[PDB]
Write a protein that binds this ligand. Structure first.
Ligand SMILES: NC(=O)C1=CN([C@@H]2O[C@H](COP(=O)(O)OP(=O)(O)OC[C@H]3O[C@@H](n4cnc5c(N)ncnc54)[C@H](O)[C@@H]3O)[C@@H](O)[C@H]2O)C=CC1
Ligand SMILES: NC(=O)C1=CN([C@@H]2O[C@H](COP(=O)(O)OP(=O)(O)OC[C@H]3O[C@@H](n4cnc5c(N)ncnc54)[C@H](O)[C@@H]3O)[C@@H](O)[C@H]2O)C=CC1
Ligand SMILES: NC(=O)C1=CN([C@@H]2O[C@H](COP(=O)(O)OP(=O)(O)OC[C@H]3O[C@@H](n4cnc5c(N)ncnc54)[C@H](O)[C@@H]3O)[C@@H](O)[C@H]2O)C=CC1
Ligand SMILES: O=C(O)c1cccc(C(=O)O)n1
Ligand SMILES: O=C(O)c1cccc(C(=O)O)n1
Ligand SMILES: O=C(O)c1cccc(C(=O)O)n1
Ligand SMILES: [K+]
Ligand SMILES: [K+]
Lengths: 270, 271, 271, 269
């Protein structure tokens, strides 16, 4: 490994995962692991925290302490925290992969500034698969969009509280925009009672909520005689981790900047 | 020697065209009549040529009494309102029905319920084998896993279907609900839009896809943490419901009165 | 209608009956000929009754030269051996060709490859739009996720298909393989039976289901730990390949010589 | 109080089984075992199964801990499992086997051992699958005769036996509901020009890829329609809790070999 990461909030589920990714992903090294001061788990050799442990890395909780230890900060904690780690990384030119999510207009507008000073990367979804699908969608909608019926089906564990999934909507948008139309115009979220006929050109959504489903999404292009279905299935929350690590590694060669998975994955030339 | 005659309501519709050739190609049945609305640009059209199988001699017409002696069993796969009269009339004159129309409001359901008093009806939400079998397997599952799992039903049908969810879906819902001493009206969820809460435990949700030429795909899902069971039926051609409805008509041979369904016909009132 | 006459190999088969009505009903195309096996119980019959309705001016037979002036493009959807014969014919006789037959051994594949020298052939493993698009999307996916994910291909077809896996599956295999600078022959795994080891990395496996009337279902799977992408195509009716092949024959028209596939036809090579 | 021996504690089922037992009131982590010189033969069975610590440690000997458990939970490989039998028999020990891939002979040995000891031998320890297994008999009963039957299963990249033992169990369920024996009509591979699917058959398709815990599909195909029954396992924990409660429930029986069905009480519809 020729580069060091910095899994913030190292002790949580995200962090843990993130640590695993750190190990596995060929080409990255675990330079650091942070955690809330005074948390009992301060001190354990990171690796140990997530399965296999040999790491010469001990979970600290001092930003400035580890200043030396990494090459790029991988932040997936709550906002404020994130905001702060950011000013640091900017002040020190450290580089970050912002998995964190939920900023206000001045948060995103904050991350904007930081950009010139340093190489940030910022995505709403660190899944390679997903980001890819999202692209493939444009392609399909392009060719078959016009004449086929488009439906989007998603399913998530019983606890999710927003319908449909934000990813579904993203899919909706991808398609909608590849067809010069706006999702607000042709979205159909419910089909109940005497509906009538599937209106030409509308996109429909079906939402399943059950069990521990991490996340299953299906894009459907239906014609008479054939249909194409593009589907993504997330088995563990690792998916995103793998995304961020790859993302992180990607940054290995830049000074300033603001990106997302398209850039990383190199998808506009796809 | 011979055999029964069948009235085929709304012979123009996609089910009509299926039903007709169905009756034609099958033993024990003679295409009694064919019917249609008044605006139909096809009254008087020859039955079989309408459905490809050449001229027959039967002609679509908009009148019950006009052909009232041309059949024994009335096969209805139109729309509720329509079916209602077919219902009424068939009573007075007393001819056995076979209804496959869906989307009945609780009241209509009652009328059918009433009419069965003197005439015999085979009212089913689906006329395939698979579905009926499934309908049963569901009771079994719900029995064991019903209590603790999350139950969802997903169905998909071609772009032209106008009632949501499929009458079959609802039949599945009912099968489950009743195997769990509860009534579907209580725990059904048809729409999930905007920030809803957590899945109010106990419910049985529905997801409806409408697209293309999908004949019919239905899935019953019993989800737990760690595992889920999915029972799924897929109809590849409308001919399956046709053969289903005809043989039902057939089953009605010698039946004086009452309400039955596919499970009765195929006889699956518990395996 | 206008112009182009089409020879329809093995007019008896399910693809024949589709192809025929396809050509009939489709503008710019005339049912040139119809063909069949050496002792088919179908010889001497008029194409339009077998598949379709309404007797016409074309009757089937077992000879190339017997109708050698009755068409321009030869549409083949028979079996390799058969198809091979035809190929010589159409070549020595400057006729265009549109092949959708599957299951060619690497040698036959060379002959087609050869013949393309003077005549124009449209050789594809699938004649639907969807599949062709998919085929492309695959390159894209394999590009990004090919390297680290496990790739598996699953296909299912009605009980009568006789070549495994589907020629389409193989085509998908190839699409992927070549997008990853590797050759399918190197990493294909067709069977998984009994004890066997850890899935050898970089291998493209195939699972083949054969059952019922399945027109055609194909799935491309890119599996990683934590997520998997599945691209799937489902053909509900044979008509899609028919319209595909007809359009092809209309396209071939003019090309003095050439070797192409549906991607060239549909013009997708730059998507 | 039912102490449990956990064979092959390193394996993915081991790590699950372990925390499973720890987590459960009533069973106590009896022992932990492993293979001749395991890269980690020894240490705290706790650390093994996720972060933290427990009194226990693991070893390569039956007798070395022979008094440390009551029920032996085996989820290793056939060969291994074989030995643990007679031992788990002679020394009168209740076993619960979830290992798969047994040749007809081994299956007999288990069959034999049940004479004096109690075994719960199942190819799958989840509820779903077991129920399914039943529903299958029902379906095959009605539609078995005329439809085409195919079984498709998919599992993570590491599985080494094809097809899944669960698949075969499904195969069997069906076969026997139709008075026929799977050996007669099983088709495992479809490669090259092969004629029309042979009418009586049950075929299998095997997918091996990624981290797939386990997906199984039973398909009854007719012309015009098809019924698909499908089970999906999202986490190995389900089989774990399954095996533990097996063992647990197995306490007290004099002897006999048993399937997850009996435990679950489903044999009666
Ligand atoms: N039980 C089963 O297996 C199936 C039930 N159905 C249900 O049966 C019905 C059939 O729809 P499709 O077959 O697609 O046919 P369709 O959707 O093409 O139209 C139905 C037919 O009934 C006629 N009709 C319509 N309104 C009428 C009225 N007011 N009075 C008398 N006749 C009228 C129409 O003119 C046409 O003949 C629907 O309710 C559908 O949901 C459909 C398929 C299968
Ligand atoms: N690329 C595509 O879109 C598609 C390709 N195919 C492939 O094309 C072929 C067509 O399958 P089907 O037509 O459904 O089979 P089929 O059951 O219809 O048999 C083929 C027909 O060709 C005739 N024929 C048979 N053997 C012949 C021979 N040795 N020489 C000359 N003529 C012969 C047969 O009499 C019959 O008419 C298969 O290889 C199939 O997999 C099928 C569908 C689509
Ligand atoms: N019936 C059910 O509910 C389930 C059945 N299984 C079956 O159980 C087996 C488990 O394989 P995995 O869980 O992936 O384990 P794995 O692939 O992680 O290997 C199993 C563990 O046991 C050890 N062990 C291996 N050979 C041994 C031997 N000869 N004697 C004693 N110990 C040995 C291995 O070192 C390793 O620690 C397979 O045959 C699998 O198909 C797995 C999960 C659930
Ligand atoms: O239960 C239903 O509503 C149903 C079942 C089969 C077909 C159709 C249909 O084509 O509308 N509708
Ligand atoms: O790739 C193939 O082999 C193929 C593709 C479409 C249909 C069929 C077929 O029905 O045999 N075969
Ligand atoms: O019946 C089986 O073969 C089976 C069941 C569950 C898991 C596994 C496995 O992970 O190998 N194998
Ligand atoms: K024409
Ligand atoms: K315990």
């Amino acid at each position: 490994a020729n580069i060091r990461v910095a899994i913030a909030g190292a002790g949580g589920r995200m962090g843990r995962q993130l640590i695993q990714a750190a190990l596995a992903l060929e080409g990255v090294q675990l330079g650091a692991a942070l955690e809330r001061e005074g948390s009992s788990l301060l001190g354990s050799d990171a690796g140990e925290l997530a399965g296999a442990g040999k790491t010469g890395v001990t979970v600290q909780s001092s930003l400035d302490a580890v200043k030396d230890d990494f090459d790029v900060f991988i932040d997936f904690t709550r906002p404020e925290g994130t905001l702060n780690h950011l000013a640091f990384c900017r002040q020190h030119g450290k580089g970050m992969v912002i998995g964190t999510t939920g900023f206000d207009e001045a948060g995103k507008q904050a991350i904007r500034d930081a950009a010139a000073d340093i190489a940030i990367v910022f995505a709403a979804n660190f899944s390679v698969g997903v980001n890819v699908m999202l692209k493939l969608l444009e392609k399909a909608a392009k060719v078959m969009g016009d004449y086929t019926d488009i439906e989007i089906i998603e399913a998530h564990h019983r606890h999710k509280v927003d319908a449909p999934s934000g990813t579904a909507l993203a899919m909706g948008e991808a398609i909608a925009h590849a067809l010069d139309k706006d999702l607000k115009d042709c979205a159909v979220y419910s089909r109940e009672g005497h509906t009538g006929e599937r209106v030409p050109g509308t996109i429909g959504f079906a939402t399943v909520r059950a069990g521990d489903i991490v996340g299953e999404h299906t894009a459907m292009f239906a014609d008479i005689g054939e249909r194409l279905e593009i589907t993504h299935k997330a088995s563990s929350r690792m998916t995103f981790a793998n995304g961020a690590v790859r993302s992180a590694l990607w940054l290995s060669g830049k000074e300033s900047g603001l990106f997302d998975m398209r850039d990383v994955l190199d998808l506009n030339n796809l």
